[PDB]
Curated annotation (Swiss-Prot), chain A:
It comes from Severe acute respiratory syndrome coronavirus 2. Changing T71I: In strain: Iota/B.1.526, Mu/B.1.621, B.1.1.318, Omicron/BA.1. This is Spike protein S1. The gene is S. Attaches the virion to the cell membrane by interacting with host receptor, initiating the infection. The major receptor is host ACE2. When S2/S2' has been cleaved, binding to the receptor triggers direct fusion at the cell membrane. When S2/S2' has not been cleaved, binding to the receptor results in internalization of the virus by endocytosis using host TFRC and GRM2 and leading to fusion of the virion membrane with the host endosomal membrane. Alternatively, may use NRP1/NRP2 and integrin as entry receptors. Disulfide bonds join C107-C142. Changing W128R: In strain: Omicron/BA.2.75. Changing D191G: In strain: Beta/B.1.351. Changing D229G: In strain: Iota/B.1.526. The chain holds residues 22 to 297 of 1273 of the full protein. Glycans are attached at N37, N50, N98, N125, N141, N210, N258. Changing N210Q: Increased resistance to neutralizing antibodies. Residues 1-273 form the BetaCoV S1-NTD domain.
Amino acid sequence: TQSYTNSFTRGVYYPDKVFRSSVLHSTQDLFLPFFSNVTWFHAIHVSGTNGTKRFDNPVLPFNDGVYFASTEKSNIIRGWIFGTTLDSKTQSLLIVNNATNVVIKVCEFQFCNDPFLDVYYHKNNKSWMESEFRVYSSANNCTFEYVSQPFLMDLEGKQGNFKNLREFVFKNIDGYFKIYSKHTPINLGRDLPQGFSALEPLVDLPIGINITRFQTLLALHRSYLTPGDSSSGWTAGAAAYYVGYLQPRTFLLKYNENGTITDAVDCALDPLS
Amino acid sequence: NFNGLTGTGVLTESNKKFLPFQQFGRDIADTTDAVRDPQTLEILDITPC
Ligand SMILES: *[C@@H]1O[C@H](CO)[C@@H](O)[C@H](O)[C@H]1NC(C)=O
Ligand SMILES: *[C@@H]1O[C@H](CO)[C@@H](O)[C@H](O)[C@H]1NC(C)=O
Ligand SMILES: *[C@@H]1O[C@H](CO)[C@@H](O)[C@H](O)[C@H]1NC(C)=O
Ligand SMILES: *[C@@H]1O[C@H](CO)[C@@H](O)[C@H](O)[C@H]1NC(C)=O
Ligand SMILES: *[C@@H]1O[C@H](CO)[C@@H](O)[C@H](O)[C@H]1NC(C)=O
């Protein structure tokens, strides 16, 4: 799947820590332009009865930060890998997640063969996937094994038509790595529903390594409820796994009286704007 | 003096709903309005003499 879909009004985060109230403020920062297009990368059982390769986890350019969204009821999505090398020459970043914990490890990951996969790849019969994650082989010189409270907190889905939506923004500038996160329990029947919501800053990890590639780590043993097609370009379908690229834009934000961003307008989309 | 932020005035408790990540308070003309105590977790209004 390589379709294209419009991102209506998403991708705004608090520029700075200072509190403000009831002020219209203009800022110039990296942002996701309104009404831009985003691709749908997909995970599917490509002949899941056999160990047939799926190629659902490709490598992307990472041009000046990445926007990310995911709309699923399970914990299938867990972990990202970054780096310009992913080799033995230079370090690599791992943001793998535990059951109720996260560990961030910048270290030299020499060989990453492939995500682990159960040959049966059926979750309609067995629902347990236990301790089957080993991707890195040789851990050479490295430090900064940051540990804290888990990024994701499981918003339980029940009664149907009600699942959590996760939004993330990854930036790496001037030796500082910033991850803005937001959980929206309300998604209803739309994968990318209309509405305005800010992105909460969560962590600030000093590393300082230049990033030019990234890849996503899926629980590739099985991922159910997955349509797929061989189409490319401007098409239609479903992938439940998005991505977007930021640009150096200028925004105007309307802080509420309590101190929460309510509306925003970009100064480059429309003459009226 | 708070964390290296010199100032002068009167300090009084105020009902400012500061979010956990938000630390300083500010308004028009880059004027500091509230500060966060380096030891206790309290937010207080600052008013010039
Ligand atoms: C963005 O994607 C849309 C389809 O979603 C396409 O029509 C358009 O040409 C693409 N490029 C833009 C808007 O620059
Ligand atoms: C998380 O899992 C990794 C992988 O085995 C392990 O090294 C680490 O100690 C675990 N941490 C927690 C808090 O579970
Ligand atoms: C790590 O540093 C040690 C000491 O300089 C060196 O012997 C080793 O080859 C280094 N390994 C990598 C992968 O850079
Ligand atoms: C990022 O660092 C690597 C070193 O492994 C280097 O080869 C690459 O050119 C750097 N990226 C840029 C844009 O210079
Ligand atoms: C600001 O927060 C208070 C406390 O929850 C609430 O009573 C008030 O309605 C809020 N103001 C809004 C939503 O405009």
